[PDB]
């Protein structure tokens, strides 16, 4: 029931600051997840559907963000790289289900939708389920940056360079990620 607002959101957020939601003591139907649509992708790692009749609804978080089509299959357990070590990392654990559907004409315009970003330059790659906020310089090597963004030390974010004439794997896929736990 309560996660029909997470699918039609006019604006999602970038992967360097996504948005969880503690879902508390309510009915979750779970039959709107399977038999939802043919063009959705429904990889599930933790537990299988048509089994989840348990009293599971103890703060189920539904992550949501937006990435490239060739970058959807980085979000799996393990699978290190640029967006799964510095932005948003999954553990080798009870992550329930990951859904990824295509945003063909919701944001992809010809001058570029600029509010989608990803943090490419980060020291000490992430712990699982960790969110980053700060926008300071990376300090890769030598001389300390008191903040000018001068040399050998980069701005931590990066833009996204939208255009409709991209490939199938670079037009954005709107991705949501659930979570399962108990008390």
């Amino acid at each position, epitope marked *: 029931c309560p996660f029909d607002e997470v699918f039609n959101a006019t604006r999602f957020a970038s992967v360097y600051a996504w948005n969880r939601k503690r879902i508390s003591n309510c009915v979750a139907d779970y039959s709107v997840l399977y038999n939802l649509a043919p063009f959705f992708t429904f990889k599930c790692y933790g537990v*299988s*559907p048509t*089994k989840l009749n348990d009293l599971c609804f103890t703060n189920v978080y539904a992550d949501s963000f937006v990435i490239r089509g060739d*970058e959807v299959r980085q979000i799996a357990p393990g699978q290190t790289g*640029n967006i799964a070590d510095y932005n948003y990392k999954l553990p*080798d654990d009870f992550t329930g289900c990951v859904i990824a559907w295509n945003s063909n004409k919701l944001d992809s315009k010809v001058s570029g939708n600029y509010n989608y970003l990803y943090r490419l330059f980060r020291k000490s790659n992430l712990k699982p389920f960790e969110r980053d906020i700060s926008t300071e310089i990376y300090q890769a090597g030598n001389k300390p940056c008191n903040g000018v963004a001068g040399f050998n030390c980069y701005f931590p974010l990066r833009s996204y360079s939208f255009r409709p004439t991209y490939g199938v794997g670079h037009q954005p896929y709107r991705v949501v990620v659930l979570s399962f736990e108990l008390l």
Partner: antibody
Amino acid sequence: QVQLVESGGGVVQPGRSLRLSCAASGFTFSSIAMHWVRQAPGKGLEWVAVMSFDGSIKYYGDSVKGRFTISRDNSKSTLYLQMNSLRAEDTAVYYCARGVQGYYDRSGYYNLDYNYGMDVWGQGTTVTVSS
Amino acid sequence: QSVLTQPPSVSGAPGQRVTISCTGSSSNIGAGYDVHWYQQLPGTAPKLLIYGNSNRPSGVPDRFSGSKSGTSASLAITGLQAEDEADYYCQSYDSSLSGWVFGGGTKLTVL
């Protein structure tokens, strides 16, 4: 840390059958699938076998079908590969390569993830058919 | 033999852009399944280079790119040094044999 060792190099006559053994060290062995690939010296790689999370689902290539069997043990942290009726072409190094975690499809059908590739590889040992 | 065709040896001058094309039939890329890339020095085991047609694991630089266009994929390296003169293989999954078939195996050089 994460690495894979293996054993079972051989010198093999016309008619023989053989078993391979690849241990695992460092990571969660009981969850991720496992792949076997081989490479004849002079040519490239060639996929051999795969076995799922529990062992219920296995697949085989055309050059190895009918003569090959597989098994794994989460207890001793080992992976096995027994091989029947070794013919006069299969002299190669044999890699045991870590796959990717399987996933659950809609309507409750467990199956392997077919998109991904093999992340971390062992060393490989060389069976040698001969005369 | 080999299922996926790629050229056996492609040369290279330092500082250039070198392509490695891997053509597969309409049953491994035509079903939508992905094309990967590996990196094998002689005397050792390969390492994973590109998975999911455009991604890269932790360890490889920014110069290793790839794509997937229809029934054929390609890899490109820009600003190559003398460190990488090893072989590269393309891997996909089909439904003609339901096996994880490879490519023929190219060969790169540094001049």
